[PDB]
Amino acid sequence: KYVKVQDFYDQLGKYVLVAPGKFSGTVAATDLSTGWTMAWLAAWNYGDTCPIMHHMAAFPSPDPYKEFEFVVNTQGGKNLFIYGVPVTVEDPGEGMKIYRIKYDGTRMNLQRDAAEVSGLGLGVHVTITPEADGYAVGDGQKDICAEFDRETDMVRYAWAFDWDPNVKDLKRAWLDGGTMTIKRLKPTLPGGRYDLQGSKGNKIDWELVPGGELAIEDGKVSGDRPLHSVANDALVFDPRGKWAVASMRLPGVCVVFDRENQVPVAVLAGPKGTPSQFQLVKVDDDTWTVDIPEVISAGHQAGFSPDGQSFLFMNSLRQNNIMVWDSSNHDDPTTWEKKAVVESPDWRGAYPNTQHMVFTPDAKKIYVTMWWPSPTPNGIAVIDAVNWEVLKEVDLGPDMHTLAITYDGKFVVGTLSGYQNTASAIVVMETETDEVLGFLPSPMGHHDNVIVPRTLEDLRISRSTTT
């Protein structure tokens, strides 16, 4: 007559959920097949004085239950002050650490801080290369992104991005257009090291929050150089190799980068009402510019479909939609043309913003989150990724964040994070008929979650191709 929660877990499979907790200061791996946390780590134990555990991505492991590795980064300084929490810390740490952590079959082991190895500290999205030989991090306080070597944690290339607005006033700096510079960023210290750990490099004193594009324009974000901000978000990888795409929130574009040859090749134009691309101009061997006549909308989330045939960029706030390019020609990204826009009448207000996304392994469906400020219920939209139409929206709870998916394609596992002070949980949805099977405890503020992949192929639908 009693129900055994074990019966629930039995159907999910031998998959390991990993998620960091933002203001909780912790990261945890969970065994979906038993309901046990496998191990957890509190960064404060390692002298971290502002352990805002932000983004993460895990390398493929042949058996996650015996061992896996992952990267998780952190944020600090004034980012401690921007949620509902009445924080009382004098002199927070600066964050921007890039921690390397290994689960050994029993515990998590801190291996090192890659920001100290490389010299470069970055605080927003973390992705793995499709070869699983490296990883990338973006940051929108410094506006730098880089790909790092897995074995030595040294920077393979870093790029730095700057805004030169047509109108020198915060309110019009983006709307009235400008020129973005893409700059090769090279080390300064012995050892080929950067001098950019912690708050070194910050043009603004915290990451822009959702809608925070309005706050910066209204002069309400402090920083040394807000007029120069582009708010880089992510550096996402083409599952086919060669290309990395850096997303830029404030000017509403993506830059496609040639990873091995270390040049940008194409600028994708996000908003409805813009061409497929803007023109990339080379200024010298290390400097490119791109001219943006006006910014119609900021964008945010960016990602490839697991076969690399589609590239997506979400417009956010001013427009709320999913922009889709035909990325089928792997040879030449200057040829990638817009082929669809996903819209809904639901999406006409400032909110919801269409954010984190995961594809099914066959690329036929996507799960994309719908984020709102308190107190509107946040949730998940099911998208037909062949016709480019919304199939359904399901309502979940406050502050929906990331989605991941079991590699068999059967279950979408996401996190809700309570705006750091309220309801938080793991959500499980089956993808056969798109029903929510329900919620597991998760006393954490997650802005990321992955399922540990086993193979290079699994990476195509983990934290590699999308955020």
The alpha carbon dihedral of 460, 386, 18, 466 has a sign of positive
Of positions 16, 38, 170, 180, contacts its own copies by CB under 8 A = 38
| Minimum distance, C-beta of residue 187 to its own copies, in the bound complex (Å) | 27
Chain centroid, CA 260 distance in Å: 22
Q: CA quadruple 313, 387, 128, 329: dihedral positive or negative?
A: negative
Give the residue, chosen from 221, 255, 413, 428, that forms a contact with its own copies under the rule CB under 8 A.
428
Of 447, 458, 461, 463, which lies in the binding site for Cu ion, with binding defined by CB under 5 A? 447
Task: Report the nearest approach of its own copies to the CB of residue 453 (Å).
Answer: 20
Nearest distance, CB of residue 339 and its own copies, angstroms? 34
- C-alpha 56: how far from its chain's center? 9
What Å distances lie between residue 142 and 64, 160, 213, 215, 295, CA to CA? 34, 8, 16, 18, 21
CB 314 within 8 A of CB 324: no
Q: Which residue has 């910050």 as its token pair? A: 202
**Residue 90 contact among its own copies, Cu ion, none, beta carbon within 5 to 8 Å by kind:** its own copies
Minimal distance, residue 300 CB to Cu ion, in Å: 5
Quote the least distance from Cβ 196 to its own copies, whole Å: 23
Site for its own copies in 11-30 (CB under 8 A): 11, 21, 23-26, 28, 30
**Cβ of residue 122: shortest distance to its own copies, in angstroms?**
22
Of the listed pieces 107-115, 161-169, 197-205, 320-328, which binds its own copies according to CB under 8 A? 107-115
Eight-class DSSP state of 246: E
The 8-class DSSP code of residue 466 comes to B
Window of 85-93, 214-222, 294-302, 399-407 that interacts with its own copies by CB under 8 A: 85-93
Q: Is 183 in the site for Cu ion (CB under 5 A)?
A: no
| Ranges of H-type helices in 63-146 | 114-118
Q: Answer yes or no whether residue 152 interacts with its own copies by CB under 8 A.
A: no
Rounded to a whole number of angstroms, the minimum distance from the CB of residue 91 to its own copies is: 9
Of the candidates 71, 96, 98, 108, which one interacts with its own copies according to CB under 8 A? 108
DSSP-assigned letters across all residues of 409-447: S-EEEEEEEGGGTS-EEEEEEETTTTEEEEEEE--S--S
Tokens of 248: 């830029």
Among 39, 170, 204, 280, contact with its own copies (rule: CB under 8 A)? 39
Burial of 240 (0-12, 13-18, 19+ CB in 10 A): middle
Residue 239: cis peptide before it, omega within 30 degrees of 0:
no
Task: Specify the residue, 276 or 376, whose C-beta has the smaller distance to its own copies.
Answer: 376
Give the footprint of Cu ion on residues 211-250 (CB under 5 A).
233
* Binding positions for Cu(2+): 7, 22, 54-55, 90, 112, 125, 153, 207, 228, 233, 300, 316, 330-331, 356, 399, 401, 447
Query: Which of 291, 384, 439, 454 is the binder for its own copies (CB under 8 A)?
Result: 439
Question: Is 75 near its own copies (CB under 8 A)?
Answer: no
Give the Cα separation of 466 and 460 in Å (integer). 9
Q: What is the maximum alpha-carbon separation in the chain?
A: 74
Rounded to the nearest whole angstrom, what is the least distance from the CB of residue 112 to its own copies in the complex?
12
Whole-number minimum distance, CB 359 to its own copies, in Å? Answer: 21
Burial of 276 from C-beta contacts in 10 A (0-12 / 13-18 / 19+): middle
Tell me which of Cu ion, its own copies, none is bound by residue 426, counting a contact when its beta carbon lies within the kind-specific cut-off of 5 to 8 angstroms.
its own copies
- Does 261 bind its own copies (CB under 8 A)? Our answer is no
Q: Does 463 bind Cu ion (CB under 5 A)?
A: no
Structure token pair of residue 406: 């079991």
Please answer whether residues 415 and 426 qualify as being in contact, where contact means their C-beta atoms are separated by less than 8 angstroms: yes
Q: Is the Cβ of residue 371 or residue 411 nearer to Cu ion in the bound state? A: 371
Partner touching 107 among its own copies, Cu ion, none, CB below 5 to 8 Å by kind: its own copies
Whether the Cβ atoms of residue 137 and residue 148 lie closer than 8 Å to each other? yes
CB 456 within 8 Å of CB 30 = no
What number of chain residues touch its own copies (CB under 8 A)?
65
Q: Does 84 bind its own copies (CB under 8 A)?
A: yes
Applying CB under 8 A, does 211 fall inside the site for its own copies? no
- 348 belongs to the binding site for its own copies (CB under 8 A): no
Query: Cβ(298)–Cβ(250) under 8 Å?
Result: yes
For the chain, the distance separating the N- and C-terminal CA atoms, rounded to the nearest angstrom, is: 42
Tokens of 277: 């691309």
**Positive or negative torsion for Cα 125, 307, 260, 269:** negative
321 or 369: CB nearest its own copies: 369
At 9, give phi and psi (nearest 5°).
Answer: -60, -30
Do 245 and 255 form a contact (C-beta atoms < 8 A)?
A: yes
The binder of 108, among Cu ion, its own copies, none, by C-beta within 5 to 8 A per type, is its own copies
Residues that bind Cu ion (CB under 5 A): 233, 447
Residues that bind its own copies (CB under 8 A): 1-11, 21, 23-26, 28, 30, 34-40, 42, 44-47, 51, 80, 84-90, 106-108, 110, 397, 418, 421-426, 428, 430, 432-433, 435, 437-445
